[PDB]
Design a protein around this ligand. Structure first.
Ligand code: FMN
Ligand code: FMN
Ligand code: CL
Lengths: 122, 122
């Protein structure tokens, strides 16, 4: 699901954005490109410190959107690229998906996104 | 209302994320930190090339969320910071707000976000 160009983006610094559906509208939170931990089976894991509203939204609708990119990776027509990722989210407080990000001692949980599509949008 | 730290973030490159309300969950698109043009009266202007789905969503619900940040600007507790912006969106195709981003020759419109709140979230 995730292409080589996406892993090239992860070699670079940047702000990741994660959109969820709440009752009254969307919500949008962040992590860092360098915090994402990618596992076998199309999983992207995010260390969770806050994300309380995000977690409440995921209870309502597990489908999330994620974007990220880097000016330092070539897109189709010039320097810079990024991705729109769609997948389903789950929060883990133990087990190997949590252990994947447990080095971040501030993390109360792991946000595990199982990717269904990844589109290079530039 | 946009604070000095937000302008410091804009001096550095990054991926901006813009969330809208779709008919079956959120939608999420991007621009670059360096593409934003900030005008008086709390207006952030984004050059629009694509964003057809985003635009359709805004026509139904003008409320948007925007995030952006930079590893290179100090947050409250370490290097790196970013912002959650909440505001209302409009798409302009003539006049001063369109002219503000018209140097981008690929632009079909200007996405004008009138900021209601800005939160430094790190
Ligand atoms: C650049 C950036 C990186 C962030 N990294 C994380 C992170 O890795 N984990 C996290 O829980 N919150 C992180 N935050 C804060 C979240 O975006 C969010 O504000 C916080 O978790 C509260 O989430 P909620 O609004 O869903 O309750 C980061 C914020 C910024 C601006
Ligand atoms: C880092 C990055 C920057 C982008 N900059 C713009 C931009 O300035 N204007 C634009 O219309 N689309 C830009 N795009 C593409 C949009 O994110 C989006 O994929 C495209 O406009 C289609 O929008 P829609 O899904 O609302 O139809 C950028 C994409 C990335 C990854
Ligand atoms: Cl990073």
């Amino acid at each position: 699901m995730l292409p080589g160009t996406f892993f090239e983006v992860l070699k670079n610094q940047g702000v990741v954005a994660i959109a969820t559906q709440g009752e009254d509208g969307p919500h949008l939170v962040n992590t860092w490109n360098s915090y994402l931990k990618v596992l076998d089976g199309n999983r992207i894991v995010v260390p969770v410190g806050g994300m309380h509203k995000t977690e409440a939204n995921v209870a309502r609708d597990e489908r999330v959107l994620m974007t990220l990119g880097s000016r330092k990776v070539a897109g189709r027509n010039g320097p810079g690229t990024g991705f729109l990722i769609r997948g389903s989210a789950a929060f883990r407080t133990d087990g190997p998906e949590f252990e994947a990000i447990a080095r971040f001692k501030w993390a109360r949980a792991a946000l595990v996104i199982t990717v269904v599509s990844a589109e290079q949008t530039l």
